[PDB]
């Protein structure tokens, strides 16, 4: 029964969570809609 605490305490899992969710990247509010920035 792991939670976000177990993910955040592990650098590999924490960085996987950060990367797979684009948490370091902003959002482009284009006229066609919001898209994550690369």
């Amino acid at each position: 029964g792991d939670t976000l605490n177990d993910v955040i305490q592990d650098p590999t899992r924490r960085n996987k969570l950060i990367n797979d969710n684009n948490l370091l990247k902003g959002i482009i509010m284009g006229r066609d809609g919001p898209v994550p920035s690369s």
């Binding site: 029964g1 792991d2 976000l4 177990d6 993910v7 899992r13 996987k16 969570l17 797979d20 969710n21 948490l23 902003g26 959002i27 006229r31």
Partner: protein, 237 residues
Amino acid sequence: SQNRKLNVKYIVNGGDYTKIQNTEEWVASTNQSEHWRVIEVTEVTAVADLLPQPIRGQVKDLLKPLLGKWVDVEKVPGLESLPVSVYRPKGAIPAGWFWLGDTADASKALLVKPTLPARSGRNPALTSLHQGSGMTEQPFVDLPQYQYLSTYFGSFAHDTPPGSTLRGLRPDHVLPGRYEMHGDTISTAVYVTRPVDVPDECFDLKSLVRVKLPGSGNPPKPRSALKKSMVLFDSGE
């Protein structure tokens, strides 16, 4: 005669997306860390807000689509039957600038100018107005969803001043306002649009909107005020 239409849609966001059609297996997979995703956002910060203050103020100022200038006004002669005087920009609009409509404000009027040139894939902040197709002397927006803040008291001239410089605004530039009726009778009833007060502020331009337009096929009655956050004053430009 008989008709039947069936539409089914599944959406998954997080969990094992390969189990979208098997609800039990997706629920079983919701405890796996490798599939956790962002399911809602409760706070969003403008990227410019992340900058240090001296740079932040400059960036905020430079992102404003419109410049602003306060100009003198002149009462438009005629229109003696109306309960409120109608005012228009005094003199000619300076080159590159534009005006926004007729106002009851006898002190000043607002002139605006775009800050960004026209480019492909960019919606301009301002739009030109054209004479109506039929039974209407009122201007019409060249682009679909744009708006203008006042009705025209006179004949809208597409190609000559002051009608040549009247412009409409992108919808994100305006917020709904509140009317203020004048005149005892519908034949002489004019609204003085005023900003809706809030704790996103809008200009108190006191734009004039005649409720009963004599013609037919008239455009929708303007109900909006211009946002203060979209206009840059004292820019030195």
